[PDB]
Amino acid sequence: GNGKLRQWLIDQIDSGKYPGLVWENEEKSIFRIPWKHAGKQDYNREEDAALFKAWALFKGKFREGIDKPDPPTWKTRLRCALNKSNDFEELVERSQLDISDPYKVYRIVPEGAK
Amino acid sequence: GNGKLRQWLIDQIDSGKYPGLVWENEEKSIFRIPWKHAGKQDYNREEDAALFKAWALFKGKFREGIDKPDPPTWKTRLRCALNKSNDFEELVERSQLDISDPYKVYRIVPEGAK
DNA sequence: TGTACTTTCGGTTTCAGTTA
DNA sequence: ATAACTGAAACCGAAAGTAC
């Protein structure tokens, strides 16, 4: 019904517009989400916050030129959404937050099971 | 007929028993309703939830000593009631949630207009 | 059956407390 | 010596649910 996160995230991954946001199997049931710490020198605000920024735009919580950009908050929102969502589940021991290009790994729950 | 919220809240404001629950003009068409986030250290359940608790008793949705106290649910109920009420309108740009003693500002709609 | 709320849904925001 | 991060929980609006 009123759920937007499930299809939207799937769409972003399927789009391939976000390097590192990729499927891990061909069943398209496990996927990889870039998760770089915004304090690292490796961080580029445009690319590394692009997914969080997309979600903030899509949900109407940010408008270009009008609201001050705030990547940390964009990040917190999507993290917290993924945490509460019944549609997604982190495979915490497959996440690689400790590498040069870090990422969390998520499973997509079949529609019914809850 | 069976609408209870309008008179009840007006009565609460007139009662003066809820510090911060006050009229903003002498026509008694605009009022201030305290709206503190319960996560603050400044939060005291007895005083800051007293109105939300009162609405829960009046509507029979809580009994002291029997049901576990639950101010968040108390708050949600009154908020969702005000959201749907045709008797009240938040003056969202005069509400002050960003101050040490936060409050929302409400307008009372004249009885007829809808 | 329509009204006036209430509860639930699907995320959002804030907190105290970590971690980079 | 501080920005960013975090899970937990309070919070939110929309809208489905429901007691008259």
3-state SS string for chain A: CCCCHHHHHHHHHHHCCCCCCEECCCCCCEEEEECCCCCCCCCCHHHHCHHHHHHHHHCCCCCCCCCCCCHHHHHHHHHHHHHHCCCEEECCCCCECCCCCCEEEEEECCCCCC
Rounded to whole angstroms, how far apart are CA atoms B50 and B78? 12
Nearest to A95 by CA among A84, A86, A87, A103: A103
Does residue B15 sit in helix, strand or coil? helix
Experimental method: X-ray
Q: Report DSSP state, residue B96.
A: B
Domain boundaries, chain B: 1-114
The answer to whether B107 CB sits below 7 Å from nucleic acid chain C is: no
User: What are the strands of the beta sheet with A103-108, ordered from one edge?
Assistant: A22-23, A30-34, A103-108, A88-90
Residues 13-72 of A with CB under 7 A from strand C: 37, 39-40, 55, 59, 61
Q: Phi and psi of A77, rounded to 5°?
A: -55, -55
A111: Cβ–Cβ under 8 A, 6 or more apart, which residues?
Answer: none
User: Residue A90 burial by CB count (10 A; 0-12/13-18/19+): exposed, middle or buried?
Assistant: middle
The answer to whether the CB of A30 falls within 8 A of the CB of A91 is yes
